[PDB]
Structures are given as C-alpha cells and as structure tokens.
A paper describes a structure:
A similar cleavage reaction was observed in vitro with other enzymes from diverse organisms, including a snake venom phosphodiesterase (SVP), mammalian ectonucleotide pyrophosphatase/phosphodiesterase 1 (ENPP1), Escherichia coli RppH (EcRppH), and [name] [name] ([name]). In addition, although [name] was initially characterized as a nucleolar U8 snoRNA decapping enzyme, it is involved in mRNA decapping and expresses across mouse tissues. Given the versatility in the recognition of substrates with diphosphate bonds, we and others have used some of these Nudix enzymes in vitro for processing ADP-ribosylation to a unique mass tag for site identification by tandem mass spectrometry (MS/MS). In this study, we sought to understand how [name] binds and hydrolyzes different forms of ADPr using X-ray crystallography.
Residue numbers in the entry:
A (entry chain B): 4 to 181
B (entry chain A): 4 to 182
Amino acid sequence: ARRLELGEALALGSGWRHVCHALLYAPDPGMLAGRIPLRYAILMQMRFDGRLGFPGGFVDTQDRSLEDGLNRELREELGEAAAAFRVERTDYRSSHVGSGPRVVAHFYAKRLTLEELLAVEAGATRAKDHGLEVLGLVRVPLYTLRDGVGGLPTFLENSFIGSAREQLLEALQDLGLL
Amino acid sequence: ARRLELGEALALGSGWRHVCHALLYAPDPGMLAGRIPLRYAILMQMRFDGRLGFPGGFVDTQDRSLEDGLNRELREELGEAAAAFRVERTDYRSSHVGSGPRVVAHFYAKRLTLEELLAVEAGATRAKDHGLEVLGLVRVPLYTLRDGVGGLPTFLENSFIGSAREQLLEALQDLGLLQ
Ligand code: NA
C-alpha cells in the first residue's frame, strides 16, 4: 500500500483506473441494551464476493470528476435516497495506491443526519445492485463488549475488500473513537 | 457440536435455555453479471457482536412451543413481513448443545417465495431489533467466482456465531441448494 497526494493521483497517466468509496455516517444517540452508546451509524456493504466494503465504484470516461463518478456509482448501489445529498471534494479523505492492479482508491467520508442515513439504509434493497453486486448493508459496531472481543474487534475479523479495513480504522481514529 | 434428537433436547430441564434460529430462503433465477446463477436467496444477519448468524432468538416462559418462540422472535428481528409465513415443526432440522451456559440451539430451514423474501429484506430496517441487536441482513453467495475463492468460500471466512457456519453448510447439502 502507498498513500498518495490527491493532486499527484489526479495527474497519474490515463492508463490507471480510479475508484471512489464513501463512508456514510450519522450521529446516533441510541444505546445498545440501554447501556452501550452507539455513537454513530456507519454503513458498510457485503459485496458479491463475500467481502465487506464501502459503497462506491469505478470512475469511468463519461465522468468529468472523481465526485460525479462517485455519486453516479453511489446511486446505483444505494438507490434514490443517495440523491438526497452529494459527496463532494470537501468530503475527500485519502488516496491509496496498492501494487497489483493499476488502481488508485480514493476514500470519502460524508456526514449526514440520522434521518438521511436511515432513509439510505431503508431504500437500499430497491437499488439496482441489490441481490446482485451487493448482498446487503451492515452497520459497524463502534463499541467493544465486556469480553474485549465482541463488537468492533470481531467485526474487524470479517473479510474486507482492498483498503476498506484501513480506510475504516483511519476514519474512526479521526472521529475520536480510538 | 453434540447433536441431540429433539425429544431429548426438550427433556433437558429447567435451567436449560432454548434458542431457535431459521434459515429463510427462496428460489432466485437471477444471474450475477448475466452469467453466474444465484440459485437461491438465503438470509443471514450481522449481529450486534460483529458475527454473522441466522435470525431468531430465545424461547421464553410465555411461549407455548419452540415454533411460537421462533416466529415471535423472527417478527422482532425482521419486522412485519416475517408474519406472511409461519415456521413450523416440518421446517425443523436439528438441535445441538450450544456455546453458552446450558443452551440448546434448535435450527429450522423455511422455504419462501422470492416475493416473500424480498419483502422481509425491504422491511427489515423498521424491525424493533434493527440498529440494536441486529446490524443488517446479507445474502449468502452460493457461487464460486472464476478465481476459485470469491463468493461462498470467502463468505465462509467471516465471523460466525455459535455453530451457524455448520448449520448453513449442512442445510446447503441436505436441501440441495448448490451444484
Ligand atoms: Na430479540
């Protein structure tokens, strides 16, 4: 893996492919078992290959920016509820270049209202990709249970796509969660 | 784990707790990328502990039977659309001594129409447990991708509760859901 400057990434040869994924989240006041604060509702997706990842996809020649790519792809995966907002350049977090495929993976985090995020959750089964490219959404448990293993640490033992695990860890550190 | 016949499992006494789970599935003629047959939609659930399991829960004092407990629990976990069908004794598959102090886990498999199963998925975010006890539904991918790893093999590498993994595989074999 290799962190790359955005300007650097945009200037990569025409050969390279770009993908954009977004962490959609909202403040959540709720309490699991009336005891353990949820803190935030964060969405991930089980992909057709059995790995957990974030919603998004490939930027294509038809797209004029990373962001039009992302939002276009977001609407496929999540359905019309995703068109209630737009992930923009101001939501951008990172670009990562692995080895293997010539792909740069850009990460975005978009804060929403709990209402908005819930509506995205509730409509995702009517999205184009549901039951095909996408197997279903999950929430990320931000809490660690009393045994120190259940909740977030066990969630992180699941199989993840690409940099999604790294991308999530980083975004939680930046939210003051650990 | 140690399989018990249903009559013996039921004969366990007083301090033993009973938990009931259902594999809900439906035929699906969909083709991934126009070429990989889905065969069936099968539901599992990301639990509050980050583990994948099947929907259901604990039978309580007020339930008349295992089946009443299971259907009640499914209504709580999945929401209203779970009440379009009823999981019966005919759907029962197995009982095992679970991981947990004195717990027997009963397992059921229930075939639905696709319409019924889509409706369980569509309503699931409004259920009582959603966002709390449960974190979200996912379909079990039954195919293996060209690389020989993506799909079912990789899915089987996720974190599972109790013996959910083993209940899935057995059910996949006995119900003839793979090729
Ligand atoms: Na419950």
